[PDB]
Amino acid sequence: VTPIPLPKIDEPEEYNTNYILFWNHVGLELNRVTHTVGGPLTGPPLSARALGMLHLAIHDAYFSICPPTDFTTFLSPDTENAAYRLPSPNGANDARQAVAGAALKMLSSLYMKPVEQPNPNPGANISDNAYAQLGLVLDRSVLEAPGGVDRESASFMFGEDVADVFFALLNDPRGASQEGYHPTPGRYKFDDEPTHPVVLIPVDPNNPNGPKMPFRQYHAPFYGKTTKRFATQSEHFLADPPGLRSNADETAEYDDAVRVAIAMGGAQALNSTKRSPWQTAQGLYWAYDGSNLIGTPPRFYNQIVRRIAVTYKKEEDLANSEVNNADFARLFALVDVACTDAGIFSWKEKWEFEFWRPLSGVRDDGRPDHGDPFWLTLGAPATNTNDIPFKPPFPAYPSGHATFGGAVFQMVRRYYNGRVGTWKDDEPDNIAIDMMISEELNGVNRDLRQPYDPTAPIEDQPGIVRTRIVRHFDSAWELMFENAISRIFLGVAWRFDAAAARDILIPTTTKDVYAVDNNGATVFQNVEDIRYTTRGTREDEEGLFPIGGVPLGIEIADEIFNNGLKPTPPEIQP
Ligand code: VO4
Numbered sequence: 001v002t003p004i005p006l007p008k009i010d011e012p013e014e015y016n017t018n019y020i021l022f023w024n025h026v027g028l029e030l031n032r033v034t035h036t037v038g039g040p041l042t043g044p045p046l047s048a049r050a051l052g053m054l055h056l057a058i059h060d061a062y063f064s065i066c067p068p069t070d071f072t073t074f075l076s077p078d079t080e081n082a083a084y085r086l087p088s089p090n091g092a093n094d095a096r097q098a099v100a101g102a103a104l105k106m107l108s109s110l111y112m113k114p115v116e117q118p119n120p121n122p123g124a125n126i127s128d129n130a131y132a133q134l135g136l137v138l139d140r141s142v143l144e145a146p147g148g149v150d151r152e153s154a155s156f157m158f159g160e161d162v163a164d165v166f167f168a169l170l171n172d173p174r175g176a177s178q179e180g181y182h183p184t185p186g187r188y189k190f191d192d193e194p195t196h197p198v199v200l201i202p203v204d205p206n207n208p209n210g211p212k213m214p215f216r217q218y219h220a221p222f223y224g225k226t227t228k229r230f231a232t233q234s235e236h237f238l239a240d241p242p243g244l245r246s247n248a249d250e251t252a253e254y255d256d257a258v259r260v261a262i263a264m265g266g267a268q269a270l271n272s273t274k275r276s277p278w279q280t281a282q283g284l285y286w287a288y289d290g291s292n293l294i295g296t297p298p299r300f301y302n303q304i305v306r307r308i309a310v311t312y313k314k315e316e317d318l319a320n321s322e323v324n325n326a327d328f329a330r331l332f333a334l335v336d337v338a339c340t341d342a343g344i345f346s347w348k349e350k351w352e353f354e355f356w357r358p359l360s361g362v363r364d365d366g367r368p369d370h371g372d373p374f375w376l377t378l379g380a381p382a383t384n385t386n387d388i389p390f391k392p393p394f395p396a397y398p399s400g401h402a403t404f405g406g407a408v409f410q411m412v413r414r415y416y417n418g419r420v421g422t423w424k425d426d427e428p429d430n431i432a433i434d435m436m437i438s439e440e441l442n443g444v445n446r447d448l449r450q451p452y453d454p455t456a457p458i459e460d461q462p463g464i465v466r467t468r469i470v471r472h473f474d475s476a477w478e479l480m481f482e483n484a485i486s487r488i489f490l491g492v493a494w495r496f497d498a499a500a501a502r503d504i505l506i507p508t509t510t511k512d513v514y515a516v517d518n519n520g521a522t523v524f525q526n527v528e529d530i531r532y533t534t535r536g537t538r539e540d541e542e543g544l545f546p547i548g549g550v551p552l553g554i555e556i557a558d559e560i561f562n563n564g565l566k567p568t569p570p571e572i573q574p
Helices: 013-017 019-037 044-065 095-111 128-144 154-170 251-265 277-285 297-311 322-353 358-363 400-416 476-490 549-562
Strands: 199-202 212-215 433-437 446-448 463-465 470-473
Touching: 013 019, 013 297, 019 044, 019 095, 019 128, 019 297, 019 322, 044 095, 044 154, 044 297, 044 322, 044 400, 095 128, 095 154, 095 322, 251 358, 251 476, 277 476, 297 322, 297 400, 297 433, 322 400, 322 549, 400 476, 400 549, 470 476, 476 549
Parallel strands: none
Antiparallel strands: 199 212, 433 470, 446 463
């Protein structure tokens, strides 16, 4: 089959001389390729789960052979419960081959055709071409692996065993099932996107030019409540969103939220849009909304973490350093597990409340002086395609991006505290990075004038090229903040989907109403002053709970970290 020409990644090629980074890279390649061909594990929550599984297998394969001192493996060889019993090396002492076996096994089990019956129903929707393209990636990775891959080594085979255990334990074949789900229309209720109410999909994935059929997609409505958590030691909840349940009386907040939504997230040319060109850039920068050759958010977070990892490594040698190998193996397991669980809980809460997206909220508001029945958002960028901006096929509260970011960056903060600088775990850090480029704005990717051609490199395809923007950030606190507000700029998130409006916006004399500048644009607090303290109530539970994605993510990362990356007790699994 003709291999898809993938655009070059903006990252020093030296990174991939390290085998932990290399295998992470392979996972990221599969992420973007599966989103280009429509293969398995697409979408935000499941793509995160795949990386968590990959790094958990790598983590245990490496630390079994090269025992850690300050912590232990995720699973142990002395577990009485077979499902949680980690294989023993028994002579295997080649960590490089152990990691290779684990990585190759896990990725193969995850992305290759589920010949073992699972092909029916679950996988019965992915074309053979999709599997073919994914296989190419895996195949050449074996050939590109630093130091080579010796499939005959005992160490390699051991790694495979490790992967088998994690796969059988954590894989959720029916994770993205939507069978039986249907929206419950009403005020504040999620329903089909007015801009993309239905889509025509081919009856046969293997014949994309043959007959189509109307399809209404709902992204993983049961995943969050039914799936097996990775390392969380409890269930996490958020305050009821403004307008619902115990907070149904929070009308001033909601009304002002509608106001901020129109001004900050509308289409570029609308007269009501007050968002600045720089804010528009911040919005697209963090997108990674499952586009061709780009993938989902977890991919970008890992790209950023890769830079942080190399920028703050203890030893200069990327290739031959056990200090670096252990550091990277540990960091990525923590980060990707935090990301996986953040995906589980953001999705659990998303479908729990089924809060509508700003587009529907503004349009269907119903009040002549509040809504705009013809409003349009900047929307999720339809990169490397000729389709128009959409909005993620799932509820708004909390923001998936915000939760993912909260988890990933709080983990990075907990991990590097006292090493890169010193800070209170709930206050701004100094983990700066520069030369950070998003593939949404890299001077290569673009908005095509015609349908994407997978046999030609993106550069040879007519379209409007995305401006290349090279960024520098002063801290993971900033990354966390900007990743969250980018969704407000795209018009896909309400302000409270990110965090409590009181913690991120500039207040006025009127309660629940926030400051705007001379030209109407919403004013945000300085990153250094932001503290996620404001909590709210839940109708179904006593106590105060976090508001928005960022606080939820922070909470998840702290818990996992504080427990040293320990499996979720099976007793508390769904
Ligand atoms: O994925 V989002 O909920 O941030 O649109």
